[PDB]
Enzyme design. Sequence first.
Site, PDB file in Angstrom:
ATOM      1  N   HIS A  11       0.719  -1.266   0.000  1.00 36.78           N
ATOM      2  CA  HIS A  11       0.000   0.000   0.000  1.00 36.78           C
ATOM      3  C   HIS A  11       0.750   1.321   0.000  1.00 36.78           C
ATOM      4  O   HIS A  11       0.120   2.366  -0.130  1.00 36.78           O
ATOM      5  CB  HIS A  11      -1.001  -0.009   1.158  1.00 36.78           C
ATOM      6  N   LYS A  36      -4.942  -9.933  -7.827  1.00 37.37           N
ATOM      7  CA  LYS A  36      -5.610  -9.340  -6.670  1.00 37.37           C
ATOM      8  C   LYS A  36      -6.685  -8.407  -7.231  1.00 37.37           C
ATOM      9  O   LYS A  36      -6.375  -7.458  -7.946  1.00 37.37           O
ATOM     10  CB  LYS A  36      -4.613  -8.562  -5.805  1.00 37.37           C
ATOM     11  N   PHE A 115      -4.892  -2.352   5.091  1.00 38.37           N
ATOM     12  CA  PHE A 115      -5.584  -1.182   4.548  1.00 38.37           C
ATOM     13  C   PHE A 115      -7.052  -1.603   4.564  1.00 38.37           C
ATOM     14  O   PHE A 115      -7.446  -2.537   3.859  1.00 38.37           O
ATOM     15  CB  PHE A 115      -5.143  -0.851   3.124  1.00 38.37           C
TER      16      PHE A 115
END
Length: 119
Positions: A11, A36, A115
Amino acid sequence: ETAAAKFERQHMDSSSSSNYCNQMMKSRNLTKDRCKPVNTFVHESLADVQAVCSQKNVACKNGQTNCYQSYSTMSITDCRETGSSKYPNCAYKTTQANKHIIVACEGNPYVPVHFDASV
Protein backbone atom coordinates in the site's frame (compact mmCIF):
# COMPACT_ATOMS: atom_id res chain seq x y z
CA GLU A 1 8.51 -10.34 5.69
CA THR A 2 6.65 -8.81 8.64
CA ALA A 3 3.02 -7.64 8.55
CA ALA A 4 4.23 -4.02 8.65
CA ALA A 5 6.66 -4.65 5.79
CA LYS A 6 3.85 -6.29 3.80
CA PHE A 7 1.65 -3.21 4.33
CA GLU A 8 4.39 -0.96 2.96
CA ARG A 9 4.89 -3.23 -0.06
CA GLN A 10 1.17 -3.51 -0.84
CA HIS A 11 0.00 0.00 0.00
CA MET A 12 2.83 2.55 0.17
CA ASP A 13 4.08 4.61 -2.79
CA SER A 14 5.39 7.94 -1.50
CA SER A 15 7.51 8.35 -4.65
CA SER A 16 -0.92 8.48 -11.74
CA SER A 17 -0.76 7.35 -15.39
CA SER A 18 -3.40 5.13 -17.02
CA ASN A 19 -1.03 2.15 -16.76
CA TYR A 20 0.20 2.88 -13.22
CA CYS A 21 -1.80 0.03 -11.66
CA ASN A 22 -0.80 -2.47 -14.35
CA GLN A 23 2.86 -1.72 -13.61
CA MET A 24 2.62 -1.30 -9.82
CA MET A 25 0.45 -4.35 -9.08
CA LYS A 26 3.04 -6.53 -10.82
CA SER A 27 6.18 -4.83 -9.46
CA ARG A 28 4.85 -5.10 -5.89
CA ASN A 29 4.12 -8.82 -6.44
CA LEU A 30 0.35 -8.51 -6.06
CA THR A 31 -0.23 -10.63 -9.17
CA LYS A 32 2.09 -13.54 -8.33
CA ASP A 33 -0.32 -16.32 -7.33
CA ARG A 34 -3.46 -14.64 -8.67
CA CYS A 35 -4.83 -11.30 -9.84
CA LYS A 36 -5.61 -9.34 -6.67
CA PRO A 37 -9.13 -7.92 -7.37
CA VAL A 38 -8.60 -4.51 -5.73
CA ASN A 39 -5.74 -2.63 -4.04
CA THR A 40 -4.97 0.92 -2.92
CA PHE A 41 -1.67 2.81 -2.92
CA VAL A 42 -1.06 5.78 -0.62
CA HIS A 43 1.19 8.56 -1.93
CA GLU A 44 1.75 10.30 1.41
CA SER A 45 4.94 9.88 3.45
CA LEU A 46 5.41 6.75 5.57
CA ALA A 47 5.46 8.95 8.68
CA ASP A 48 2.10 10.49 7.79
CA VAL A 49 0.50 7.08 7.24
CA GLN A 50 2.06 5.58 10.38
CA ALA A 51 0.61 8.59 12.23
CA VAL A 52 -2.92 7.43 11.40
CA CYS A 53 -2.55 4.76 14.11
CA SER A 54 -2.89 7.54 16.70
CA GLN A 55 -5.83 9.23 14.98
CA LYS A 56 -9.59 8.47 14.83
CA ASN A 57 -10.34 5.01 16.25
CA VAL A 58 -13.14 3.33 14.28
CA ALA A 59 -14.52 -0.19 13.86
CA CYS A 60 -12.83 -2.39 11.25
CA LYS A 61 -14.87 -3.94 8.44
CA ASN A 62 -14.24 -7.35 10.03
CA GLY A 63 -15.57 -6.21 13.40
CA GLN A 64 -12.24 -5.77 15.16
CA THR A 65 -11.60 -2.49 17.01
CA ASN A 66 -8.07 -1.64 15.89
CA CYS A 67 -8.87 0.55 12.88
CA TYR A 68 -8.04 4.22 12.52
CA GLN A 69 -9.30 6.85 10.13
CA SER A 70 -7.08 9.72 8.98
CA TYR A 71 -8.08 13.22 10.12
CA SER A 72 -6.97 14.66 6.78
CA THR A 73 -7.59 13.40 3.25
CA MET A 74 -4.67 11.63 1.58
CA SER A 75 -3.58 11.27 -2.04
CA ILE A 76 -4.30 7.69 -3.09
CA THR A 77 -4.60 5.52 -6.18
CA ASP A 78 -7.22 2.79 -6.33
CA CYS A 79 -6.51 -0.22 -8.56
CA ARG A 80 -9.39 -2.34 -9.84
CA GLU A 81 -9.16 -5.46 -12.02
CA THR A 82 -11.02 -5.17 -15.33
CA GLY A 83 -13.36 -7.80 -16.76
CA SER A 84 -11.06 -8.51 -19.70
CA SER A 85 -8.28 -9.21 -17.18
CA LYS A 86 -7.08 -12.82 -17.17
CA TYR A 87 -4.20 -14.28 -15.14
CA PRO A 88 -1.23 -14.11 -15.56
CA ASN A 89 -1.93 -10.95 -17.59
CA CYS A 90 -3.81 -8.99 -14.93
CA ALA A 91 -5.28 -5.70 -16.19
CA TYR A 92 -6.20 -2.84 -13.85
CA LYS A 93 -8.11 0.44 -13.89
CA THR A 94 -6.10 3.31 -12.39
CA THR A 95 -8.05 5.93 -10.43
CA GLN A 96 -6.48 8.77 -8.45
CA ALA A 97 -8.36 10.31 -5.53
CA ASN A 98 -8.04 12.33 -2.33
CA LYS A 99 -9.86 10.63 0.53
CA HIS A 100 -9.51 9.73 4.20
CA ILE A 101 -7.95 6.32 4.72
CA ILE A 102 -8.77 3.68 7.33
CA VAL A 103 -6.03 1.26 8.39
CA ALA A 104 -5.76 -1.48 11.01
CA CYS A 105 -2.78 -1.17 13.35
CA GLU A 106 -0.97 -3.74 15.50
CA GLY A 107 2.27 -4.36 17.34
CA ASN A 108 4.97 -2.48 19.19
CA PRO A 109 5.69 -0.13 17.53
CA TYR A 110 1.95 0.24 16.80
CA VAL A 111 1.90 0.48 13.00
CA PRO A 112 -0.38 -0.10 10.00
CA VAL A 113 -0.75 -3.76 9.00
CA HIS A 114 -3.92 -3.71 6.87
CA PHE A 115 -5.58 -1.18 4.55
CA ASP A 116 -9.26 -1.32 5.50
CA ALA A 117 -10.95 1.35 3.39
CA SER A 118 -10.96 4.84 1.91
CA VAL A 119 -13.78 7.27 2.71
